Design a binder for this molecule. Structure first.
Ligand code: ZN
Length: 199
DNA sequence: ATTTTCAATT
């Protein structure tokens, strides 16, 4: 297991794990949540020294054997840690490999946060939409009520994501021929869920 | 455009 270099900083993401996790292929994949924090200044976006970070659904705990719930809930507690103030506007984007998520408290608590902080802008990016049965359709509409901000990832974003999430020299990102077929479906799948809004 | 996928330990 070569894994990422020990002398290297944990801020860099391994290329195999990043590609394998973003590959969305059939086999074994660990759910990962990536988020970014930026400070807006009079309409001017400003980035801090380094607030990039991500969370995984895999943790350790043999003595308690207890596992954390949805990674989205854990990030919710990360909001108060930053101590965001209502006098300023901050842009927070959450990236999740899967979009579907059945739960009566996950989206419920997340929706309550948006209602409590209407000045906070939250963007949700769905790398792939296929994890829960069609029921997730109603769950998506519930979150869309307060999170009316849904966007799909594009191949161009993948190139930048690798450089931003991965910074290796001599190992360029090698895109797989699968975004074109899903890229068009992602737009069709996203509008399909919103099409129910006409009802 | 589609691909009948692992996640709590030893
Ligand atoms: Zn959830």
């Amino acid at each position: 297991m070569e894994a990422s270099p020990a002398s290297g900083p944990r801020h860099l993401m391994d290329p195999h794990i990043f590609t394998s996790n973003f590959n969305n292929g059939i086999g074994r994949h660990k759910t990962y949540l990536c988020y970014e924090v930026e400070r807006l200044d009079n309409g001017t976006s400003v980035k801090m020294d380094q607030h990039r970070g991500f969370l995984h659904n895999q943790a350790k705990n043999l003595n308690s054997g207890f596992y954390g719930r949805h990674a989205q809930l854990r990030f919710l507690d990360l909001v108060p840690s930053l101590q965001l103030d209502p006098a300023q506007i901050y842009r927070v984007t959450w990236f999740i490999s899967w979009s579907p998520c059945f739960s009566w408290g996950c989206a419920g608590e997340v929706r309550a946060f948006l209602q409590e902080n209407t000045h906070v802008r939250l963007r949700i990016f769905a790398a792939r939409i296929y994890d829960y049965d069609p029921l997730y359709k109603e769950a998506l509409q519930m979150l869309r009520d307060a999170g009316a901000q849904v966007s799909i990832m594009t191949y161009d974003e993948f190139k930048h994501c690798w450089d931003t999430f991965v910074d290796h020299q001599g190992q360029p990102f090698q895109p797989w021929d699968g975004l074109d077929e899903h890229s068009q479906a992602l737009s069709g799948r996203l509008r399909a869920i919103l099409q129910n809004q006409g009802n």
